[PDB]
DNA sequence: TGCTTCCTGCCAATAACG
DNA sequence: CGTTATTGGCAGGAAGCA
C-alpha cells in the first residue's frame, strides 16, 4: 500500500502508485484516495465528487456564497483565503501570514461541519 | 500574470471500539 | 462511557489553468 523511506532516522512513507512522500501515515491515506476512489465525496449540490472530504466542502462554500473570511482593516469580506490574502496584500499593503492578525475567519454558518 | 484549485503538516473534533 | 482510531478543517505556498 506504502514504503517506508528511512534517512538519518527520519520516517517518511511512499505513495506506491505516484511514489509521493508523506511524513505522516495519514496524510499518505487521505492522499491515496485519489488512487483508489475507495470513498466519494460527491457535491451536495451539483454532480461533482471528490477524492478527499475538503475538496468538496471548498466546493460546497462555492454554492452558498457565504464569504468567511473579513479583512478587518476595512471590513470587506471574501470567500476564502486566496482572495482574503491578496486584497490585504494589495490594498493594505501586509501579510496576514506574518506577526500580526488581520483577518477573522467567521464560523461556517451555510452549511454543517464540525466547528471551533 | 492573476485568478482557481490543489496539496500536506498539524491536530481538534468526531467516531469506532469494546 | 473511558480509551483508542479516524476524519477533515485550516493555513498558506504550489501547481494548474487561460
Ligand atoms: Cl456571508
Ligand atoms: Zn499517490
Ligand atoms: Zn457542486
Ligand atoms: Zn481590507
Not at 42 to 50: G, L, M, S
Request: charged residues 25%.
Amino acid at each position: 500500500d506504502h514504503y517506508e523511506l528511512i534517512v538519518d532516522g527520519r520516517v517518511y512513507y511512499i505513495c506506491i502508485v505516484c511514489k509521493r512522500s508523506y511524513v505522516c501515515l495519514t496524510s499518505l491515506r487521505r492522499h491515496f484516495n485519489i488512487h483508489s476512489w475507495e470513498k466519494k465525496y460527491p457535491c451536495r449540490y451539483c454532480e461533482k465528487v471528490f477524492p478527499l472530504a475538503e475538496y468538496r466542502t471548498k466546493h460546497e462554500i462555492h454554492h452558498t456564497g457565504e464569504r468567511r473570511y473579513q479583512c478587518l482593516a476595512c471590513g470587506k469580506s471574501f470567500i476564502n483565503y486566496q482572495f482574503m490574502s491578496s486584497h490585504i496584500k494589495s490594498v493594505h499593503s501586509q501579510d496576514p501570514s506574518g506577526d500580526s492578525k488581520l483577518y477573522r475567519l467567521h464560523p461556517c454558518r451555510s452549511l454543517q461541519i464540525r466547528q471551533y
